């Protein structure tokens, strides 16, 4: 209806929008974004597209596409008459003779359904399914092309009851068109039907057999698009209806082997996704047996690079990537049983003079490692030094994936004595950490970190060279590589422990780290691995970290507080206040815990002048249990380091621990139970009020069956410590816990924790011996677990044992000790005077 004048100036505007020079283009678009705010404009756009057939097809289409963008944004304020007019024009004129016009109309229909929503245009689905039978191929083709994108956008919408589920006609209506003469039609049909498989929508599950039959009929179509979509369909079926597909499986996999070799990359990629998805299934192991000899070479050949990847480098998902993942899974499934089909390719690939072939070989060697390790062992004496040598190859990609492969054989490398394989590997690998190509830097540093997790103490002779190359890496690593260098340094620190605590190493390492720390910002993204790095470094250096702990402490306090403020704003009103990643706060808390434990009372000048106790109190009831775990650990370490700052808040903390003393959160409950013990020892007799609110819970916990060893040990130790500082309150309870207490602590080292716990059990025996007299054999067993007790604790054991011997009498003690095992009897006898 809108027509005549103004249309000349709109045609002028379109001509201007098609300007050759950018200057007019990027000065005309302002006029367009001023005109969108007048909804009548859209009538002229759809009119130019649909009806002004005297103007050229590009201009008409461009009008349509401008109208597309006007729907992509601020479609909210479109008038109902305008929307109905565009709906009507597009949906009537779907099969225009020009394919460009046809596709413009298709994307208009798509966008008008994608923005907005389907139930605001509900006649669309029936109306264009009725056009689907049309005798004009173009109208049928365009209707299907729109349908496909509607399905791709809105699968879980049509599955839901929000539109009375029109799928129930669409699915069979589609299924009829698998038969159709045109390959494009068949492609659209199966592409529509594919979207609903994983949703396992009922409308398709109830025709699964018709669907599978039409797939088998299409299997022989030498059109690539059809085979692509059929591969996607068969991939999805492996996940959902494995049961219905199983009887046919051998034919399927023969087809899919011929399809993975197919001369098109996309077809091949889907056919390989097939193998990846199948190898995950539990039935697989017996399925592929008669095809593995034909499958494995196809995957190996796929693991070569394409020439296109060669030229690009010197994608996120490739045929190579998928083939290698499939081979890794097949390795983990068949273990050693895979080797006879793959080793003969290896001993050819690995020595080839075409470097890409050699590369595919090293990659295959790495990919099978996890599953095939045991059967690979007798060849590693040849392979590992060859891989070392390949770290010298002129082509960088070889060096990179060789680093990774060696990393995946680290466990065997460290089992052999250091001079054989480990020292050569480490020398060459440190050398290539300083390689000139960033790919090699990344791969070498990652492989080296992976190695350092397993070399452990064996690294200490090399620390000088290690730290030299590492601290030098700070100057060359620009972006991504620097983060992995933090990972490597943290792994080195965790791997060697206190053997790093020497001032020359500190002088090498701390200046660049503290530089990066000071110049990194609260809102930055690099400092997460650096926090983990410094947690490792400080936990290893302990007291040697003292000159550097100021900025990290204040920064971490800031992180915890900022996280808590963001979380508050989020819990009050989410729309403007997105929640923070509490991982930052968790690593900050763990790092402060390590600082306290490693530096001791030297942390007082930082605990005093900071709100760390307020923030910690703010953490201990956070609904994420890892936060609570970290916070209780930090509570205990502050208790140990400088309790004078903590003593005023004990009345606030102790009830919270009384609430969270709960073993269904094992990891949390451990640290909480332990903090109670450290706190009781620092408080002393002042603990009398807080004993009953925790004692019943501890007694329940230690008697819990099938409970992990660490929690049980810490529970017993804390019970003993509370009994040490408050014996009257705990003493009536020994009847109920002495048996598992000794069953646990008989296994633990003679550290100060055990000393505190046994001082506690002795102090409690001095108030109530009966609760031990009930079970005294287990106390004898536990005391026998002591190798080197303190002299006064040894006197206390003597006084208990003799006092109970004189209570029971000589002949009764004889019978009571007759069935001790010999080490028990004899240690107890010699060490305490029988």
């Amino acid at each position: 209806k809108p027509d005549e004048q103004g249309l000349q100036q709109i045609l002028q505007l379109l001509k201007e929008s098609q300007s050759p020079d950018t200057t007019i283009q990027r000065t005309v678009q302002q006029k367009l974004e001023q005109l969108n705010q007048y909804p009548d404009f859209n009538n002229y756009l759809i009119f130019v597209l649909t009806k002004l057939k005297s103007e050229d097809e590009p201009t008409r289409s461009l009008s349509g596409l401008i109208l597309k963008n006007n729907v992509k944004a601020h479609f909210q304020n479109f008038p109902n008459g305008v929307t109905d007019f565009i709906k009507s024009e597009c949906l009537n004129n779907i099969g225009d003779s020009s394919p460009l016009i046809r596709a413009t109309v298709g994307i208009l229909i798509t966008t008008i359904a994608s923005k907005g929503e389907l139930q605001n245009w509900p006649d669309l689905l029936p109306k264009l399914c009725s056009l689907l039978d049309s005798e004009d191929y173009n109208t049928c083709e365009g209707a299907f092309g729109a349908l496909q994108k509607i399905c791709e956008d809105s699968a879980e919408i049509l599955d839901s009851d929000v539109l009375d589920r029109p799928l129930n006609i669409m699915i069979p209506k589609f299924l009829q068109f698998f038969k159709h003469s045109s390959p494009k039609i068949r492609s659209h049909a199966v592409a529509c039907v594919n979207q609903f498989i994983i949703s396992r929508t009922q409308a398709l599950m109830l025709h699964i057999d018709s669907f599978i039959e039409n797939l088998f009929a299409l299997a022989g179509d030498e059109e690539p698009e059809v085979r692509k979509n059929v591969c996607r369909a068969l991939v999805m079926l492996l996940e959902v209806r494995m049961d219905r597909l199983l009887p046919h499986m051998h034919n399927i996999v023969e087809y899919m082997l011929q399809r993975t070799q197919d001369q098109d990359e996309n077809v091949a990629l889907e056919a390989c996704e097939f193998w990846l998805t199948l190898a995950e299934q539990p039935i697989c192991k017996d399925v592929l047996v008669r095809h593995l000899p034909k499958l494995i070479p196809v995957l190996v050949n796929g693991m070569k690079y394409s020439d296109i990847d060669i030229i690009l480098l010197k994608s996120d998902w490739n045929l190579r990537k998928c083939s290698a993942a499939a081979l890794d899974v097949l390795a983990n499934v068949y273990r050693d049983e895979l080797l006879p089909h793959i080793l003969p390719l290896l001993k050819e690939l690995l020595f080839h003079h075409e470097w890409v072939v050699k590369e595919s070989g090293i990659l295959v060697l790495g990919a099978i490692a996890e599953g095939c390790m045991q059967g690979m062992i007798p060849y590693l004496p040849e392979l590992i030094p060859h891989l070392i040598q390949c770290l010298s190859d002129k082509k960088a990609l070889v060096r990179s994936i060789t680093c990774w492969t060696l990393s995946r054989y680290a466990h065997w490398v460290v089992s052999q004595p250091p001079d054989t394989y480990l020292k050569p590997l480490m020398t060459e690998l440190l050398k290539r950490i300083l390689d000139s190509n960033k790919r090699v830097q990344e791969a070498a540093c990652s492989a080296f970190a992976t190695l350092e997790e397993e070399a452990c103490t064996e690294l200490v002779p090399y620390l000088a060279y290690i730290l030299d190359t590492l601290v030098f890496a700070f100057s060359k690593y620009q972006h991504k590589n620097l983060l992995i260098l933090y990972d490597a340094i943290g792994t080195l620190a965790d791997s060697v422990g206190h053997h790093l605590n020497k001032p020359e190493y500190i002088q090498m390492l701390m200046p660049p780290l503290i530089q990066k720390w000071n110049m990194l910002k609260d809102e930055d993204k690099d400092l997460f691995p650096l926090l983990e790095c410094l947690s490792s470094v400080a936990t290893a250096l302990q007291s040697g970290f003292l000159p550097y702990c100021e900025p990290v402490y204040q920064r971490c306090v800031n992180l915890v507080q900022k996280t808590l403020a963001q979380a508050m704003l989020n819990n009050a009103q989410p729309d403007q206040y997105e929640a923070p990643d509490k991982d930052f706060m968790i690593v900050a808390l763990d790092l402060l815990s390590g600082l306290a434990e490693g530096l001791g009372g030297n942390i007082e000048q930082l605990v005093a002048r900071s709100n760390i106790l307020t923030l910690m109190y703010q953490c201990m009831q956070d609904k994420m249990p890892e936060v609570r775990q970290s916070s209780f650990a930090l509570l205990g370490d502050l208790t140990k380091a400088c309790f004078q700052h903590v003593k005023p808040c004990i009345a606030d903390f102790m009830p919270i621990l009384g609430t969270n003393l709960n073993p269904e959160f094992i990891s949390v409950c451990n640290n909480a139970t332990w903090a109670i013990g450290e706190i009781s020892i620092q408080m002393g007799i002042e603990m009398q009020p807080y004993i009953p609110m925790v004692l019943h819970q501890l007694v329940e916990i230690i008697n819990r069956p099938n409970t992990p060893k660490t929690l049980l040990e810490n529970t017993a130790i804390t019970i003993g410590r509370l009994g040490y500082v408050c014996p009257q309150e705990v003493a009536p309870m020994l009847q109920q816990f002495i048996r598992p207490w000794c069953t646990s602590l008989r296994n633990i080292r003679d550290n100060e924790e055990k000393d505190s716990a046994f001082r506690g059990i002795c102090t409690m025996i001095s108030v109530n011996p009966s609760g031990v007299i009930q079970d005294f054999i287990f106390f004898c067993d536990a005391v026998a677990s002591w190798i080197n007790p303190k002299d006064d604790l040894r006197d206390m054991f003597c006084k208990i044992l003799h006092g109970f011997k004189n209570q029971v009498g000589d002949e009764n003690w004889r019978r009571f000790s007759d069935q001790f095992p010999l080490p028990l009897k004899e240690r107890l006898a010699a060490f305490y005077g029988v």
Binding site: A324, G366, W404, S446
Partner: peptide, 7 residues
């Protein structure tokens, strides 16, 4: 951890 394996 998510160390840069090649697949």
């Amino acid at each position: 951890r998510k160390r840069s394996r090649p697949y």
